[PDB]
Symmetry: D3
Subunit: 297 residues, 6 copies
């Protein structure tokens, strides 16, 4: 099982064993929950949470999409997130805030169930490159599921694609949109490099990644030209490099897609430089990016 330890449950910390909810909870039946993925990294000055405010802002934004009411002020959630790290003595960990519709009723409409229940849990936490396979499941259109939010139900699509990719022998899935263009990974944003230029994929139906945002800023600071474009699978096949970004995935080089090697078939220099600066940033070794860190101690 997950070694989470003390979990913040609607205002107070309780042992993991006591962090449970009714099986009649609306979210367990209809996917009506929202969550975030946040990381803390150890630094010379103790644990530092990466871009906490941006993650909390998105958490509340996701709730708004479902017209879900979070009965806590953003500042309270931010304090709870800092405390879940402190109270458990974590240094490098993954933090998972979750807001879900409770068991007041089970009609499909979740409004009668407001306000949402909320909890925050956490647990302690390249050159070869990842191998991807294009999925037979398309990322949902923008008027089918809210792709800019981390809504629980959305991940049935990610789960189906990820299972398919792993079953096929790949590390991750690459999903296309319904029109046939590249969208993103089951849980990562995509980038590719061609003739020295870095191409970030347009937001289309993808989540607006905070890691993606961070990597674009880093890339420009390093002097690279960055263009935002729509891309096809074969534009990726012919790229010099391809890489993915995400809180859990950090910056991961992609060496092969659909059994077709990308460039030299191993992680490229651009993706590796971006990954290195990103890791230096999250560990408090880049003064120019200290604004992105929230020190727990």
């Amino acid at each position: 099982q997950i070694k989470a330890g003390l979990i913040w449950m609607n205002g107070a910390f309780v042992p993991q064993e006591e962090a449970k909810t009714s099986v009649l909870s609306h979210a367990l039946h209809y996917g009506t929950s929202v969550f975030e993925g946040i990381r803390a990294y150890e630094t010379a000055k103790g644990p530092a949470i990466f871009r906490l405010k941006e993650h909390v802002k998105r958490f509340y934004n996701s709730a708004k999409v479902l017209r879900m009411e979070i009965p806590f002020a953003p500042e309270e959630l931010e304090e709870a997130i800092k405390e879940v790290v402190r109270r458990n003595g974590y240094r490098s960990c993954y933090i998972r805030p979750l807001a879900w519709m409770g068991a007041k009723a089970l009609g499909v409409n979740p409004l009668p169930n407001n306000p949402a229940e909320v909890m925050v849990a956490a647990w302690e936490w390249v050159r070869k490159g990842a191998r991807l396979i294009t999925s037979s499941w398309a990322r949902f259109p923008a008027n089918v599921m809210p792709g800019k939010a981390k809504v629980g139900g959305n991940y049935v699509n990610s789960a189906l694609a990820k299972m398919e990719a792993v079953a096929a022998g790949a590390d991750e899935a690459l999903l296309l949109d319904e029109e046939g263009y590249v969208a993103e990974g089951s849980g990562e944003n995509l980038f590719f490099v061609r003739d020295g230029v870095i191409y970030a994929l347009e937001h289309s139906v993808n989540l607006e990644g905070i890691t993606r945002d961070s990597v674009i800023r880093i890339a420009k600071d390093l002097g690279y030209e960055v263009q935002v474009v729509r891309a096809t699978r074969d534009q990726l096949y012919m790229a010099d490099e391809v890489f993915m970004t995400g809180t859990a995935a950090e910056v991961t080089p992609v060496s092969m897609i659909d059994w077709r090697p990308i460039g030299k078939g191993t992680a490229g220099p651009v993706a590796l430089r971006l990954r290195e600066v990103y890791l230096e940033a999250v560990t408090g070794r880049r003064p120019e990016y200290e604004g992105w860190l929230t020190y727990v101690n």
Copy 2:
């Protein structure tokens, strides 16, 4: 919810004890499957409607997610009969649920198998619809033939929109623009004496829809299955929807445009009444669809 005793992975427990970890995969990623089953009071006690058909779909939904249900269908069927008996229910709604637990939180749910399972139950002018701005998911985006938890975010968004607009229910179109179904009901319309059931397209294959078609044919109605547009519904003599919870519900208006006379029509009302007679054990011809708990 007044559920009372709930069957939890093999044994009944008080409602307050029917809880699961907040780290359960399904609570974060919508990886659960469920069913909606009804029991109606008859002269011979409570009767569950088309129990085996619902249980079959439950396991079918699980297969779509490659979810393993650690119980034989026969065991779940017994649990469903028992949730009615042990709680002393007569007319009730039964909700079986299988969900991925808290073994891990990677998006891939396979490491979380087998699924946890529970069965709960609780005693149990025409509708006005508005076409939704949310389209029912394409067949390669979400599994529309299964009752997978995550699917219902789409239904929830559409239902909230309809209610906020002043309607009773939402009518969702598919991405191409054709009529799909309600947030939780299959659709039918009637024109010049003929009953038109909508093709399955991206919709759930409703058991009530199936029941209604059989009843309609038995009553002598001509039934055709077609793809339909919103304006084919606007000009229909009648429109109605079906579902376990919705039974057979007449639709009197869509997008503020009256359907036919603007009130519940004769065909929808007749099908609803005959359906009620079937589920309450008044029609010998349909007794095969009933499972008497006593």
Copy 3:
């Protein structure tokens, strides 16, 4: 100009010259009108209007799509339609009822303009086959324009396709839907015949033609098997026959599509038989179909 003569204008007949409306009429700016196409044919017992009630029903149905209020009872319109034939001494003519939003205001919302203005005008009115060309304009999706109604604005799509077809040297345009399947002509429903079976195209985004309905009934009465299906352009290219139906088009055989001959390259026997029975029906020579006729005298 059109030789219409006496035109029924909101309750009373007036000379064609007096049948005018403000240039500030909502329908002249935003396509907010509905119309019908009805024909009267000369018979041994005088002029007979074909399926009048079905056409009037559709007229009111089209108005409902626009939430347009027609300030006359269907029976009044039916009488006006009979009178436009009588008063002008017509025998074989085309009848055009039209309801349009007036000049009360020019906001895009037409509701403030209700009730609609209404008028009814009329004017006196194969083996080679028609040549069609597939259009570069797609028939509108069912959630873009109301394709089951004869709404004025809809015909911008038909006009663009028809102009294109004529410019290319064809007689009529064949429109596909956005997905690439055959839809219908700019103003006609489509049918094809293969191995003795008659295939009527599904309604999809097309208008539910009354001529199409009539031809299907006639076909079945003649003993032909009729199937309703979705079709692709190449299914038509390989058909034994292809034909179109419409009030103005009656039953018209199609001998060529996209410069590819259909079957023998001339009208086929099936389309010709259906056309003949249809013409016998509308001229009062088929006792079994007399229910479809409304004799003006």
Copy 4:
């Protein structure tokens, strides 16, 4: 409508005489083109805003329908100035219209050329939007870059739906599910200090949109052009729309979800005010956009 003297194919006539045959092609098939132009009162009299740009689009719209306008642009420009002068208007809305007449009623409009033309004019918290169930037409279905009469059946359906639902305006998506525009307004949103104008996609290339972008850049704002989804708007700090009739209108709520603070935002209000200063002749930098009638 209090239009007064209307220019009809070359000469002004009383409003009551400005009529056309009910057998006019455009009244049956939507084959007309129009423009929306405004005149604002300035210290130097009425000034028409971006007259030549609007006249150019008028002729461009006609080309899409292969419609022949039997007058030179210069003649129409003079007619537009005169409809303001002869009626003694100061702040007014000007509506030029070209339509296919009554020569014939075959669907093909070519036999009806040249088009008839008229020019009429009349004195002239944040908006709440709801996403429409009607999608703006694909680029190969209706000519979305032209103000063709028939196109507005789509706008009318969406607007009626929005108003019936309790909103002020409709937000239409394209068939693929992305945001397109309002029933008669282009859309913008603001996030983290950056102004985002939506790409042209299937929308009309608004002159107000163009004006707003120029003003925003001149004021020092960063402006990006992107494709957007409904939930990108839900999470924006601000959303606003532009159009000749709508000027610059802030949007405080979409689908009952508040945008930012739930009230008109600073950027939208500032752009609206500077735009008003430009059209009323208070900003020398934008005088090139004005045509003084006197």
Copy 5:
């Protein structure tokens, strides 16, 4: 390929001489049409299955490309019978091909008419045994969608179309499956890389609508056989999950005959092995093509 004597635009020549210019339009632009026909040995000699239906489709495919075949259908039919006789074949696969030649290489193929035509045939190296048939084929849904009806002519066997089939088949094999299941652009099931699909549920046999698929002659044959056996057959549009929950799934094609499908996307179909309906249909189909069914003799053309 051991084809032997090949019919080349009117006359048979040794395989070594059956070559065409590398400047042929079809080698650069996919402008060819072909057919897949089979001759099955019987006690009365080889019998070609539904020859006229295949030849009709061959000419229909050519019409889609506005390709002119400079031979009458009867001439091609005789050549098809002769390729079997002249090579002394019993059972064999027959491949007629019409392609645009090397007159020019502008994308427009009209200047290249008339098309060159050839008919070749060769023997099978091996056949699947009942054990393999019963285990059933494993399919995986492809990331490549079958082309929309206004993108490529899906009702014709046009060479270029098969780039789509090739991409899907390679993907399926690489993923460990036997065949690919392609969806259409809208997300519904279309067909395999070279087979039509069917599924069985609650006693009813469901054939998929034609949609963007090729109108298979094997599909047609199976439907006729199923109806003759007393089965109810319905034609519908289907989703991947309707197949996941079917009692049985099977595919048809000249090369594939009737092949049961036991798993799709690692999800077992029904019992996880071939079912009784597909196995029965396959048996009757094989009895028909090998001349053991008097009622279906009209479908056979005996070479001798």
Copy 6:
């Protein structure tokens, strides 16, 4: 076609010997890849335009099909230079082609690797004069949509892809136009049957986004030239009516060079004849490919 000596998998042979089996996978299934390269005569001998960029795309196209080209890029580059020299050509069109051979005819082409390769070249019969260029090309929007990105590989020059181009070109010519303008399935402008599109409005040059189109080398060259001349260039998605109202429209391609478009769907573009921007870009492009522009010499590979 008068090609003369053709390079066939490693060595030059007379055209008559440059033939391949009619059982070649690519002749039946469109499994080939090719390039369009040009050599322009200069006072210093023939100069091949952007040779390495074309060769890179050739190998990239092969990768999409998982096709193995058994030659190093440098070998192909030498063969391309030699086909010009050995035939004594000055200006000429060069056509490299890699195709799947006749090892087997299962739809999966992997068993057929490695691919066969050839390089042929031939001279132009005629060129358009300034009069024709100024009149401009007339386009008509096609009823055939360019394939979605998950249907056919639109970034590669794969043989099968051109069935779509062939159908569109035939349709356009039959309608009386010079070329077809294809839209994508969603209704937006894609490209011509074999040319990328550009339009000019209010002084700005608009290149179309790549969408489902091929990333043209001529398109790339024109954008560089336009920027060097001082023009503002933007890349956007466009609709047919945005082109109808453009001041100018033009298309690019190796064979098409820079061709002004004066009419689309019988609607005149701007003045109804070629405009000054397209004519200027065409002139500078021609100066570049014929070695009259020192700043662009890096794009040329002199055979002598």
